[PDB]
Amino acid sequence: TNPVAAWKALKEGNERFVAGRPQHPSQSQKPTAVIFGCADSRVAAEIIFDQGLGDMFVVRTAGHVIDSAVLGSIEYAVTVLNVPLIVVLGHDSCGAVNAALAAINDGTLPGGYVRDVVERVAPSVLLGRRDGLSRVDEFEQRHVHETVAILMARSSAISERIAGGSLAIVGVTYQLDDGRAVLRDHIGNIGEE
């Protein structure tokens, strides 16, 4: 019902997952959070954060790429379903980011609608390279950061609710082999204090 309670639920759920003591095995009302994840993730966010049925509204694309339908999906959860928290969720060994890194090397983009994915991931890799980054996971962390920024800049409905106090957005990553959800970016009050 607010960003503090929503983030508390996810943080505790990931503590239970990491501990190997889940409350909602195979997931055992209106959603607590929007999760914006990557299509090549190897594990469901509902497992990572140990949530039950209907707790999460989940949007997923290759490399977290955003177009109008992706944006409208997230805006729908916030404005229609009144969801109080958006989590941009990144992961280790992201293949989409590796594909973007490959295209930059070769100086040309792939064809068809695959172009549309790589051209939306490549800007973050280029910013990353300007700042001295060189590894897929470093680029993915930067791309999570940039994706949070894109969502606020492109959607007045999102940005207004964050300013107004009823929405927060966080950038979070995990490494599959350790399971910990690492909080990176946080815009709005989520009760960390």
- 69 contributes a contact to a copy of itself by CB under 8 A: yes
Among positions 4, 172, 186, 191, the unique one binding Mg ion when judged by CB under 5 A: 186
Q: Least distance (Å) from Mg ion to the CB of residue 29?
A: 27
- 61 contributes a contact to a copy of itself by CB under 8 A: yes
String marking each residue 83-122 x if it binds a copy of itself according to CB under 8 A:
------------xx--x----------xxxxxxxx--x--
Residue 130 and residue 11: Cα distance in Å, rounded?
A: 33
CA R_g for the chain:
16
- 183 contributes a contact to a copy of itself by CB under 8 A: no
Q: Least distance (Å) from a copy of itself to the CB of residue 103?
A: 11
Instruction: Tell me how far the alpha carbon of residue 133 is from its chain's centroid.
Output: 20
Q: Which of 46, 39, 66 is nearest to 148 (CA)?
A: 66
Is 91 assigned a ligand-binding role in the annotation?
yes
CB of 16 closer than 8 Å to CB of 25:
no
| Angle at alpha carbon of residue 138, lines to 136 and 139, rounded to 5° | 65
Q: Which of 161, 193, 165, 183 is nearest to 80 (CA)?
A: 161
Among positions 1, 67, 126, 165, the unique one binding a copy of itself when judged by CB under 8 A: 67
Q: Least distance (Å) from a copy of itself to the CB of residue 192?
A: 27
Chain residues that interact with Mg ion, rule: CB under 5 A: 186
